[PDB]
Design a protein around this ligand. Structure first.
Ligand SMILES: NC(=O)c1ccc[n+]([C@@H]2O[C@H](COP(=O)([O-])OP(=O)(O)OC[C@H]3O[C@@H](n4cnc5c(N)ncnc54)[C@H](OP(=O)(O)O)[C@@H]3O)[C@@H](O)[C@H]2O)c1
Ligand SMILES: O=C(O)CN1C(=O)C[C@@H](c2ccccc2)Sc2ccccc21
Ligand SMILES: O=C(O)CN1C(=O)C[C@@H](c2ccccc2)Sc2ccccc21
Length: 316
């Protein structure tokens, strides 16, 4: 299994990255350092995770230790929803760059297609429990992302949580300057995303699978929710290959030509999660894992279902 995939900007993206959502500032510095030591070169970040300073410290530390070169790293961050206004995008990107102590990002994503009212608060809600949106739109936000490229702040731009119609909006944009390189979407055996993956891949857009382990630490988890890591059917697949359930869950997207970004702050797990280039899932295993699809989302953005750009009304 080649370790990197070719992007439409000529750059190569490692197919296995480290997630950092919910990684406490108290622990992510260690997490990243260990990740880099055991082979990870792609780190998935976001301003909204409010830990990019601590990620940056780890990277800086390992550059000065001479463990890795900036050029070998693929650092990804995302524009949060309260910064969709054209006038706010550069400042949002430069803040991320400053926190990460970098002078470029390899990839910068619009985190969600939905713009939220600008302000200090990351998720402003109204008295009905719905998000307070902003007067922004995807195309205008995209043009703002293009300038980041044209100014050298990021090497590639993409999108996250966009449905195929929203992607299409950008693709068909008059005066398009840069095609999206990546669409980062939730993907695992309970949400297999066949049609959206088909769509993106046919459009030369690389797909990154988030929550590949089913995000057991998601803050809104309910006891009765489906649990991938516990799923006895998947454990059985793992046992057969003498690997852990998580390793099977990370290898699965890899064999669908996806990028995958499992999150851990546990040093032992960070290392284990990377040990997935030494076995292959059988044709039967893949077919089987794909058959567990339930269209079940970790991240359904339920507070925004009335937003004009809410992505998950569409079938895909
Ligand atoms: N673009 C978006 O809107 C979006 C949305 C969600 C996620 N993402 C990105 O995708 C990453 C991955 O998704 P995620 O954080 O939702 O969840 P995930 O990676 O599916 O699951 C992380 C959970 O799994 C546990 N874990 C990791 N390795 C394990 C192993 N080998 N055995 C047992 N448990 C293990 C972690 O625990 P410990 O950390 O305590 O070890 C943590 O609780 C995020 O961190 C983020 O970078 C992007
Ligand atoms: O419902 C979801 O899909 C996730 N969800 C959010 O969308 C609601 C969000 C929120 C909570 C409080 C103030 C502002 C915003 S984040 C959240 C937290 C707990 C539970 C759920 C959420
Ligand atoms: O967007 C992600 O990558 C995950 N995620 C967050 O990082 C946003 C998080 C948040 C919500 C409210 C105040 C502060 C932070 S949780 C969340 C909820 C819905 C959707 C997404 C999130």
């Amino acid at each position: 299994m080649a370790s990197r995939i070719l992007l439409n900007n000529g750059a190569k993206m490692p197919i296995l990255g480290l997630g950092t959502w919910k990684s406490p500032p108290g622990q992510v510095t260690e997490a990243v350092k260990v990740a880099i030591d055991v082979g990870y070169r792609h780190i998935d970040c976001a301003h909204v995770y409010q830990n990019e300073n601590e990620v940056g410290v780890a990277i800086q530390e390992k550059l000065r230790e001479q463990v890795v070169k900036r050029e070998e790293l693929f650092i990804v961050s995302k524009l949060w929803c309260t910064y969709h206004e054209k006038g706010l995008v550069k400042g949002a990107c430069q803040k991320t760059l400053s926190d990460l102590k970098l002078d470029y990002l390899d990839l910068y994503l619009i985190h969600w297609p939905t713009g939220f009212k600008p302000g200090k608060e990351f998720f402003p809600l109204d008295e009905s429990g719905n998000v307070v949106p902003s007067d922004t739109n995807i195309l205008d936000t995209w043009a703002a992302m293009e300038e980041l490229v044209d100014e050298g702040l990021v090497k590639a731009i993409g999108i996250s949580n966009f449905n195929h119609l929203q992607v299409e909006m950008i693709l068909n944009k008059p005066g398009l300057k840069y095609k999206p390189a990546v669409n980062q979407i939730e993907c695992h055996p309970y949400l297999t995303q066949e049609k959206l993956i088909q769509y993106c891949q046919s459009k030369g857009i690389v797909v990154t699978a988030y929550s590949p382990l089913g995000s057991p630490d998601r803050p809104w988890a309910k006891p009765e929710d489906p649990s991938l890591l516990e799923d006895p059917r998947i454990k059985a697949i793992a046992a057969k290959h003498n690997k852990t359930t998580a390793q099977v869950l990370i290898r699965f997207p890899m064999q669908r030509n996806l990028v995958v970004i499992p999150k851990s702050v546990t040093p032992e797990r960070i290392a284990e999660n990377f040990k997935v280039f030494d076995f292959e899932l059988s044709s039967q295993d893949m077919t089987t894992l794909l058959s567990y699809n339930r269209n079940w989302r970790v991240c359904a953005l339920l507070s925004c279902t009335s937003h004009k750009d809410y992505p998950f009304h569409e079938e895909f």
